[PDB]
Design a protein around this ligand. Structure first.
Ligand SMILES: NC[C@@H]1O[C@H](O[C@H]2[C@@H](O)[C@H](O[C@@H]3[C@@H](O)[C@H](N)C[C@H](N)[C@H]3O[C@H]3O[C@H](CO)[C@@H](O)[C@H](O)[C@H]3N)O[C@@H]2CO)[C@H](N)[C@@H](O)[C@@H]1O
Ligand SMILES: [Mg+2]
Ligand SMILES: [Mg+2]
Ligand SMILES: [Mg+2]
Ligand SMILES: [Mg+2]
Ligand SMILES: [Mg+2]
Ligand SMILES: [Mg+2]
Ligand SMILES: [Mg+2]
Ligand SMILES: [Mg+2]
Ligand SMILES: [Mg+2]
Lengths: 126, 63, 50, 121, 59, 76
RNA sequence: CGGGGAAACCCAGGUGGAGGCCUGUAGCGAUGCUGACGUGCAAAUCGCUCGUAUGAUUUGGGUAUCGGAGCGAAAGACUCA
RNA sequence: AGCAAAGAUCUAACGGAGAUAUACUCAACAUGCAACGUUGGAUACUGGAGCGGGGAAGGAUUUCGUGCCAACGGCACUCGUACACGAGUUGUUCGGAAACUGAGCACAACGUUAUAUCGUUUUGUUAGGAAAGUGAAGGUGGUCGGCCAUAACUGAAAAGGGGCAACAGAGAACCUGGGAUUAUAUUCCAAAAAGAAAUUGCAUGUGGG
RNA sequence: CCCAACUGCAGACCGUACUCAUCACCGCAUCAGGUCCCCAAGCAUAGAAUGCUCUGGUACAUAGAGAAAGGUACACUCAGGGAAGUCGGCAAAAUAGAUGCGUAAGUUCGCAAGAAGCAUUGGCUCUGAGGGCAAAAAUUGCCAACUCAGAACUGCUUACGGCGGGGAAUCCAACUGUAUAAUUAAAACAUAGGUUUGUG
RNA sequence: AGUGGUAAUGCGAAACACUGCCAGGUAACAAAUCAAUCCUCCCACGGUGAGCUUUCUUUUCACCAUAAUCCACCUUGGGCCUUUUACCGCGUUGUUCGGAGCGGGGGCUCAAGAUUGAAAAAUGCAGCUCUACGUACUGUUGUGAGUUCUGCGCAUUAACGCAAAAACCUGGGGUGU
């Protein structure tokens, strides 16, 4: 009757969890005389105990939602819930811009398009 | 998403403990310990406590 | 927990070896007095606190 | 990601043709055919089902010179130069195999690096 | 496996497993039980069979 | 564990008294001669399959040779 | 960086991230319902609402100060109901 | 009176004494109700500040298997952290100690007190206060190629006695795999150690001065 | 005698099971109270808020049948009126996110300030901007990750959760803070600032 | 009785051997900003198995692992050396730097990684195929988001300035002479 010892040893041999082990409801006779980890490993090998697959958690409903949001479909004013400077921080927008400007000025000065007098004038104005 | 335990009888996040969170050949995260580091060999405090060159930061038995 | 002194472990080990019932042949001696043990300690009812 | 998508451009997508060519996917139908169940009335639709429902550049049923089938002895052999997945024709077999209630009798099963095999349970 | 006295170390258990029993202990793993007794696991040197010793003791 | 560079240093390690066993591992590309000495495990990586068998024949007489296989769970 | 001015200096756009600053979790408190309970879940708790939440902030272990004495941002409060 | 917070259970097959339990002339409903465990299935919940997985303090066998239902688990029980019986905690490296100092403590010494059960005792540091028992260099005479090293006299130099107090500070040489448990494991695994190392003490041999 | 790389041998003591809590500790008890530390997934969203979900766990806290009155609720609505109720707007209602505009008296010029008060917000199909590294390189190739603005077209029953009601004055204390564990959180206490006294 | 390089400083099988006395360093502590490691999450590639299919879905879900310890040595942040001397220039998201030596050209180093290898496939996992806890085979991207490890201090607000010691390390001086 009590298959509780063979259900505990099966969760620790299969390494999964008790809502995920499947003990065969017909062979409650062949299972209940296991008493060892060696015997439960024979019952797992015989198909009397298995791991069931995990329950589904699908991202297909998010992935289709992301393809709308990549074309900008659900981002308007009513759908915006947090502040402007939390969705896009204005320090991040300044840091990203100023690094683009300084990387370009090092690129044109190393390519010798501009002079070091032109660089230093355009560096502090950037 | 895997959650891990301390493994070495001490369970407090001090600067001596500082665990390292690594994946094993048996495909599990364990929790290994980071060694404390040395500041390195220095110039005297009264001369400007500066790091010497050509000398390595070696702690206690690696020194 | 894990830390105990060995002199506390050996006092906790004596009380495990005292927590056993009276055997049945004690109840069959001549001038018998003892039916039950009167000192059966349970870990939840009464605390040793060593 | 560089340029925005359009909803109207979901008709035609990019299949990313191979550089070298000839990625070939055999499907061995020898057990359900010779041992009864699949006659030469369904096996002539099995070679038809892939020509009719394999998608190529997003569109269904319009493969021309990029997918070729040609039906060997008991093997349906999909020769292509477009980047398909081997896991796609296991999928596209199970739709045909569900449509004729044969997905309680037949397992499609991987045997080699570029072939399947319909077998019984 | 033996109950030993609780005030012996692992070195003097190996030397008693040589004078009593003519075998060689390579590894002793002692354990003071919740009963209060010290239990030792005593691995022999693979030149000595464990059952051949345990028949001579008798168990 | 360490690693042997040449063959003149491999034969000095197999001449040592601590070298219990040389384990021979046939990779699909190379072979590995894993000498198990008393502190380190020395490995000679011979990439050529024809020169590998010539090196096995020079450690014939009194060192233990072991063909490394996949021991199953049932040997335990 | 720009602009105005003879000068003294003013005016603007950014940058920056200061505070016993603010809204608000956890934490720490306990305003109102004079709510529930009031032989209770509880010899003081439950519920919602509320005070604060980078600081005179919260907290563990260890230590040190007591009976006409201790300690007290002070209520004769607290010192194992 | 009550056993009303923390949503919630349903189903079939087995198990079990716990049933499908009937004096006639009765087909069944209207004369055995309720309730238990396990596995399967369905339905939910917790929702990673968890009715998750490990530790301290505290507990000290509640752990585990097997039996078992008198009393206890405010209903129930075939279940149990109950009861009886049998087991179970494996370390050169993990935590502590050996072996650190901190806030502090107060042994010796000194003072006090009718009375030590009292005081001082880290601001560099005891005590009116001779608390170093260690030994540079050399002399004396068995050893290794004027250097060593090993044994016994003389004497430079070191002011400031001991011991505690931190399982979260300091310090600390081991990591995976395991078919290795009913229960322990960075602790068990023995010749292919599943194995790969790191470290301490002492010793041979080879080689070098 | 010194030293290297190696080798040979040995590596002692104690702890280690289980728990750490809506049952294992403390409150007389398997008590809705308290109780230090570490690990910490997905989607919505500013998000350790809040709502739901894969992993892990759970279905255990006496249940069944069931329209009284009366209650209690981390439950709702209510026509017309709109504080007339009441010691007292107590309790509920109301306000609400985000973006654009706008904002008074007073002021220690720092604020008041989210003052007040207005407007916009969906879904869909597009268009603009905001970049990288690889070879008048002021231009040809290839490519990720997102954000904002604009535009037609179309719909609204104004429709999860979460989230300030606002204004005019008077009293008192400057402020944040502390504070009668278990009826008083205050205007009390503290505070910076001010003064005094004793002291070489 | 150590020895290379103008120099930053280099070279370790066993003499570059030892330490009455002395002096340093390590232990040894520090915000926020930005950049962020292990790792997590996502996306992208695919392979294996599973789930769905009246219709649709080149589809949804799971998995895809690499421990210490060595060995050999491409980046991007510190310090510096040598050469040219420059007083406008270099640089950061950011409050600044330079004849008391900026910037270039060559270097020397340190710190954090990357990479090749020994370990290590012999292991791990999921599949599957054959006549008993049996066997033979088959598979093992990212200028995305979060991460205090690190950069990192004579290092924070400050009338706040942030423990100690054991143990160890190097030098000075001496011995070897
Ligand atoms: N040494 C270089 C000099 O720079 C000068 O350039 C300066 C001027 O052109 C100009 O100076 C302006 C000017 O517009 C006007 N006439 C006066 C004004 N005060 C100045 O403004 C300047 O100073 C104010 C401070 O008051 C700053 O806010 C600001 O950075 C700067 N624009 O801005 C420049 C300073 O940044 C001139 N080219 C010349 O005098 C010379 O080359
Ligand atoms: Mg506030
Ligand atoms: Mg009073
Ligand atoms: Mg009831
Ligand atoms: Mg839920
Ligand atoms: Mg009962
Ligand atoms: Mg009992
Ligand atoms: Mg409780
Ligand atoms: Mg009105
Ligand atoms: Mg920092």
């Amino acid at each position: 009757v009590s298959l509780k010892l063979q259900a505990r040893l099966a969760s620790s041999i299969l390494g999964c969890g008790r809502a995920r082990v499947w003990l065969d409801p017909n062979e409650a006779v062949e299972i209940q005389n296991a008493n060892s980890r060696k015997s439960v490993r024979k019952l797992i090998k015989d198909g009397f105990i298995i791991r069931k697959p995990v329950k589904v958690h699908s991202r297909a409903r998010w992935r289709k939602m992301k393809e709308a949001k990549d074309m900008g479909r659900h981002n308007g004013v009513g759908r915006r819930e947090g502040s402007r400077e939390a969705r896009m921080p204005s320090k991040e927008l300044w840091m990203r811009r100023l690094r683009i400007l300084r990387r370009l000025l090092r690129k044109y000065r190393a390519d010798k398009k501009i002079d070091r007098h032109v660089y230093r004038d355009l560096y502090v104005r950037a | 998403c895997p959650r891990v335990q301390y493994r070495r009888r001490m369970h407090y996040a001090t600067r001596g403990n500082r665990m390292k969170m690594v994946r094993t050949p048996g495909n599990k995260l364990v929790m290994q310990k980071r060694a404390k580091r040395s500041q390195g060999i220095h110039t005297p405090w009264v001369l400007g406590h500066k790091r010497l060159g050509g000398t390595k930061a070696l702690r206690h038995i690696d020194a | 927990g894990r830390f105990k002194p060995l002199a506390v472990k050996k006092k906790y080990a004596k009380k495990m070896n005292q927590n056993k019932p009276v055997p049945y042949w004690i109840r069959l001696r001549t001038g018998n007095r003892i039916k039950w043990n009167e000192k059966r300690r349970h870990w939840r009812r009464t605390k040793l606190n060593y | 990601v560089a340029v925005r998508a359009k909803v109207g451009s979901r008709s035609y997508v990019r299949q990313k043709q191979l550089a070298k060519g000839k990625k070939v996917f055999k499907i061995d139908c020898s057990i359900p055919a010779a041992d009864g169940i699949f006659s030469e009335d369904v096996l002539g639709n099995f070679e038809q089902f892939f020509q009719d429902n394999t998608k190529l550049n997003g569109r269904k049923g319009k493969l021309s010179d990029k997918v070729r089938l040609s039906m060997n002895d008991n093997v349906l052999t999909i020769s292509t130069t477009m980047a398909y997945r081997k896991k796609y024709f296991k999928y596209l077999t199970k739709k045909f195999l569900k449509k004729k209630d044969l997905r309680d009798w037949i397992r499609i099963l991987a045997t080699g690096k570029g072939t399947y095999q319909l077998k019984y349970f | 496996t033996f109950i030993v006295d609780s005030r012996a170390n692992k070195t003097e258990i190996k030397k008693a497993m040589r004078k009593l029993y003519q075998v060689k202990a390579v590894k002793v793993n002692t354990l003071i039980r919740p009963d209060g007794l010290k239990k030792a696991y005593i691995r022999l040197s693979a030149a000595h069979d464990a059952l051949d010793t345990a028949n001579k003791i008798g168990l | 564990p360490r690693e042997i560079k040449t063959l003149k240093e491999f034969l000095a390690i197999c001449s040592r008294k601590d070298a219990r066993c040389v384990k021979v591992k046939h990779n699909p590309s190379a072979t590995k001669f894993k000498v198990r000495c008393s502190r380190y495990l020395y490995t000679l990586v011979v990439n050529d399959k024809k020169k590998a068998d010539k090196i096995e024949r020079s450690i014939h007489p009194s060192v233990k040779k072991i063909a490394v296989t996949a021991r199953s769970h049932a040997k335990t």
